[PDB]
């Protein structure tokens, strides 16, 4: 089970962890997360299920973004199968719920209420976007970095705990 503070932070390293069944959209979102030259060393981590095979030297994950593809019920049922491997101290600030595929609204095997209920019953931000289009990635990936600098503590006024009090 992943923990928010088991590992010490880096120096300027803010290492997000995208968790989603589809890895093409995760790779595109990670490419957009590093396209801009930010002031933080973003070591983006990809995944499919949070079990996350136990490999030491893994950095202090400062953010987990459960990319829930609303087109596929697998991306949800695997997300709730990955939410049972998270800390209760991880859902405070360092957990976001990306809902890709939404807005198209014709391919959604998941009603967008079910994902908002999922993200509200874990008390964590739910950030909607559409990862298949770059024009909505580069503006949402820069949202996952400004969240990441908040949870990683790079903005020296706002904690991860302070984040969900702002995104509630």
């Amino acid at each position: 089970v992943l923990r928010p503070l088991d590992k010490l932070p880096g120096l300027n390293t803010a290492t997000i962890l995208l968790v989603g069944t589809e890895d093409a959209l995760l790779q595109q979102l990670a490419d957009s997360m590093l396209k801009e030259d930010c002031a933080s060393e973003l070591k983006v981590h990809l995944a499919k299920s949070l079990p996350l095979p136990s490999s030491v030297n893994r950095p202090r994950i400062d953010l987990i973004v459960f990319v829930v593809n609303l087109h596929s019920k697998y991306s949800l049922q695997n997300t709730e199968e990955s939410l049972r491997h998270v800390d209760a101290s991880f859902f405070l600030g360092k957990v976001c719920f990306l809902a890709t595929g939404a807005g198209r609204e014709s391919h959604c095997s998941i009603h967008r209420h079910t994902v908002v209920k999922l993200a509200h019953t874990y008390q964590s931000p739910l950030l909607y976007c559409d990862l298949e289009v770059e024009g909505f990635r580069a503006t949402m990936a820069q949202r996952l970095v400004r969240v990441l600098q908040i949870c990683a503590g790079h903005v020296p006024g706002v904690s991860a705990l302070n984040l969900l009090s702002l995104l509630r």
Partner: peptide, 17 residues
């Protein structure tokens, strides 16, 4: 997790204050 996370939020926000 809603209640167990509200309790954790209260416990952590008291520490932050």
């Amino acid at each position: 997790a809603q209640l167990s996370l509200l309790i954790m939020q209260v416990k952590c926000l008291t520490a932050e204050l």
